[PDB]
Amino acid sequence: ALRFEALYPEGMCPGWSVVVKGKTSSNTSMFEINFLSHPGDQIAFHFNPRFASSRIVCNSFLANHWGKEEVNKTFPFEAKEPFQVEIYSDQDYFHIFIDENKILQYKHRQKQLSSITKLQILNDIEISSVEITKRGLY
């Protein structure tokens, strides 16, 4: 189920942060935050915390296929407890912070960063806030 979508047609990458606060409803489901590129609604970045297995799966869906999964060594979420996830893009990575701690980086596979105009948040997350902010590049 779609919980939140945002569209910024001029392209929200690189140099933008998405900050999502919320918590899961279940102990053993999952949610995803996807960054989609236009045209095609390809998934440039899929961030998928899976609470049954305590694994964060990251991937891209390009040319009608999922690529190689990048699975983080740790799982800094707790089911049913509030978290903050920030995803910030630079020229080379999506950088993921959870509760203000740097957790992982994911190298861009879709290189056409300015085509990433759409954010979707799906499945088991009760959102308390979404912030989309133009940070720039440092």
Next chain:
Amino acid sequence: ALRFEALYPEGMCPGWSVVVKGKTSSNTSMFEINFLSHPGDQIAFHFNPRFASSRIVCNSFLANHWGKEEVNKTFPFEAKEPFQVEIYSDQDYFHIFIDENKILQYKHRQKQLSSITKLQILNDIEISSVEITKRGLY
């Protein structure tokens, strides 16, 4: 021109805050922030700062007609200068704060508040941030 859209299908009213930060590009154009209700994409609240005339026009577009304009001349904007607009809904009004000053309140005309699932930001605004927060008091 659509600059930003957000969809929150469970309803973002009442008790949510939307904070928009940005600046205009022109000295004498205009932008609008619209809260839309589903089904129908009716405009529950249209917030339209008009820089040529220094007037904030507020209205609703329901049953295929604009209603009575509620116009504020406080116009605490300056062309090309960063601003912060916060729109917070309670059970009775949309409350508007600009640069942390309360400017106006607008009584709900669309009474089906939970049907307000969509935010659109159009025309002459260069967005630097959009934040959408439940329990908009915090």
